Structures are given as structure tokens and as C-alpha cells.
């Protein structure tokens, strides 16, 4: 199936407390493989998956230099953005960046991303054509015009459609068994009565990978949102994920409700019922 490589960068100003915190992580699909944390000891890019450890010193030296240049760039950005919005030195502010590429089942380029957020809101993003920019506000327009003048999109595009895809392919093959796997959800159901005339049905999905899944409750064959509670998909800690979907049902009609599970590890979507 499809695969992705994604890098996530977070830079946080620390008013009256020195240099910004900078954390960078790399993912292939839902598997992290590298990290840099400004508050860690090595001050280097560090391996986080067995399959990346084999890369030689040339690799690590390079990623280390690049991740520092990324750090340095956002250190300046925090100041630039504070000026753009005429903000005081009193407050802490956050710059976030994400970029990377998707490939299809044929491991050929599908899509590229390159997006910035300031204080948790969209600031600027490369559009899907990888040739133009979406700026969130008037301040962001200044960045847009500067990036148009420097022909940034053209250079990003070459990386996203070419180099980024090259890395993803190389990572996927070195990853081999773990990376390319899909683990179907191990399901089960719970049932604790709440009130005299009501009861809770919780549909469980465990040990699945990748993280992408869909749990849905149906009543007499039709969906239900709004009495259904969905917790956010969560890491189990062993490379698998977990999720659940609950619904409160009239005490006595438990058999009229069905949980529907959709995951790419499942040949066909599952329909479950309490019994």
C-alpha cells in the first residue's frame, strides 16, 4: 500500500530563559526513525529505529548539520514572526513545520507537503501543485512574497518529488519486515450498565498498524454520531496502536447495535455485536 516520510519540527521561544527549545523527529509511516532534541546531550541527529542504525557516519554527519540549520532557521523565524505581529518579549511562542512525501503502492511519488504553523494556527503552506503558496493572513503574505521572490517552491518541489522519494524507498527496503507490515486489529467488546435503563457498549481495537483506522457504531443498520465517544488513537508502545468507540444504549437493545471496523490489514470491514 501507500507509504509516507514525514519530518516534524517544533521551536518554542523561552522569554528571559535563553535559546528556543528545538525538537525534530522523522517518521516513515507511523514509525519514528530519527530525533534531534536541543536539550539532549549529543547535539546530533539520533537513530530511533533499528534499520536506520546501519547508515554510516557520512549520513549522521549530514543529518546533524541539516537539522542544526533547521534549528537556526527557526530561531530567527521566532524573532521575525514576533515582529510581524508586533508581539512583546514577555510571551512564549511556537513555530511548527512539517514536510515530506507520499508514494503509492508502486513506491512512486504521489504527493508532497511543506507547511508552517505559528502558535498552533496555519501560517503558510505549499499547495498541492507544489508551485504556489497559501498564506493565512496579511503577515503570512510577507513570507509568501519573499518565498516567491526567492523561487522557493521550485526548489522544494525538486526535493519533495525526487530526493524525498529516494529516501523513502531506501528506508522502506532497509526496514524490510517491520516497516512494510500491516497488523489487523484484535477486537473485543465491553459492557457495563450505567443507569437502570441504560448501558455502555465499548468496541475495542488493539495491536494494529498502521495507526489509521475507523471505528463506527450502527443502530439497526444506520450510523449514530451523536451518542458515540471516540478516544484518540494511541501508541501501545510496541509499534502497535489502540483505539475504542463507545455508545450508550437503552438497557435491552444491545443486540440492535453493531460496531464497524475498517483497517487496511482487514480484508473486509468487520461487523461486531454484543452477545
Amino acid at each position: 500500500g501507500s507509504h509516507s516520510m514525514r519530518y516534524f519540527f517544533t521551536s518554542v521561544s523561552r522569554p528571559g530563559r535563553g535559546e528556543p527549545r528545538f525538537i525534530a523527529v522523522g517518521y516513515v509511516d507511523d514509525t519514528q526513525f530519527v530525533r534531534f532534541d536541543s536539550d539532549a546531550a549529543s547535539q546530533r541527529m539520533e537513530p530511533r529505529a533499528p534499520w536506520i542504525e546501519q547508515e554510516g557516519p557520512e549520513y549522521w554527519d549530514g543529518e546533524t548539520r541539516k537539522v542544526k540549520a533547521h534549528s537556526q532557521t527557526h530561531r530567527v523565524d521566532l524573532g521575525t514572526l514576533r515582529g510581524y505581529y508586533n508581539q512583546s518579549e514577555a510571551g512564549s511562542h511556537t513555530v511548527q513545520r512539517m514536510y515530506g512525501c507520499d508514494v503509492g503502492s508502486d513506491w512512486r511519488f504521489l504527493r508532497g507537503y511543506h507547511q508552517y504553523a505559528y502558535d498552533g494556527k496555519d501560517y503558510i503552506a505549499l499547495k498541492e501543485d507544489l508551485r504556489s503558496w497559501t498564506a493565512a493572513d496579511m503577515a503570512a503574505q510577507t513570507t509568501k512574497h519573499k518565498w516567491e521572490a526567492a523561487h522557493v517552491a521550485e526548489q522544494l518541489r525538486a526535493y519533495l518529488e525526487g530526493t524525498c522519494v529516494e529516501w523513502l524507498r531506501r528506508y522502506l527496503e532497509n526496514g524490510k519486515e517491520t516497516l512494510q507490515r500491516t497488523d489487523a486489529p484484535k477486537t473485543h467488546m465491553t459492557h457495563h450498565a450505567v443507569s437502570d435503563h441504560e448501558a455502555t457498549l465499548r468496541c475495542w481495537a488493539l495491536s494494529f498498524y498502521p495507526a489509521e483506522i475507523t471505528l463506527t457504531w450502527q443502530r439497526d443498520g444506520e450510523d449514530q454520531t451523536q451518542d458515540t465517544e471516540l478516544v484518540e488513537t494511541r501508541p501501545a508502545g510496541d509499534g502497535t496502536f489502540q483505539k475504542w468507540a463507545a455508545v450508550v444504549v437503552p438497557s435491552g437493545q444491545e443486540q440492535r447495535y453493531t460496531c464497524h471496523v475498517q483497517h487496511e490489514g482487514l480484508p473486509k470491514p468487520l461487523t461486531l455485536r454484543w452477545e
Binding site: T10, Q32, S92, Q96, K121, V231, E232, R234, P235
Partner: protein
Amino acid sequence: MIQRTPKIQVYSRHPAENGKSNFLNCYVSGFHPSDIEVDLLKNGERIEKVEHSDLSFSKDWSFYLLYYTEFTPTEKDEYACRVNHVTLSQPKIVKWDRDM
């Protein structure tokens, strides 16, 4: 400025079974800003030997972190996660419901 309160989930890595080692997890997601303190509590006392994941974020830019510790669930010992964040008027304590 964007402010999101953390969604907190406390749970084990594998289905819990008294007497057998496992991992106790506290997963905090959907929060902003990134500053947050998280502790795992055994019988109301903080556990020192806890690890945590590298800060990362979702599509909506909200952050997530996994705090985790190795442990052996015994019928007595109770477990909880305490979370403090600027969106919280007071720290939140989420107990480990071994039976959810």
C-alpha cells in the same frame, strides 16, 4: 494564541495480568502550547524511572506525548497519571482503570 487542553489516557501496553511485567502508559494528545508536565503515580507517589517520547504533533498542529514506565501490575498497587497544563485550573489525575 491557540490553547488546547490535553486529552489524557492511562493504560497498559498489553492486557493487564497480575504478576507479569508490562508497561504503564500515559498518553496526552491534542494539547497546545507544548509545555506540560506528566507524572505516573504508584500509590499516590510519583515514579522516578519514567520515560517519554519525542514531542510531535498531529495534522491540526496539536501536540502528543507518550509517558511510560515498566511495571508489574499487582492486585494491590494502584496507578494514576497526573497532568499539568496551562489550560488546567488544577493538575488532573487520571486513574488507571485496569478494567475499561
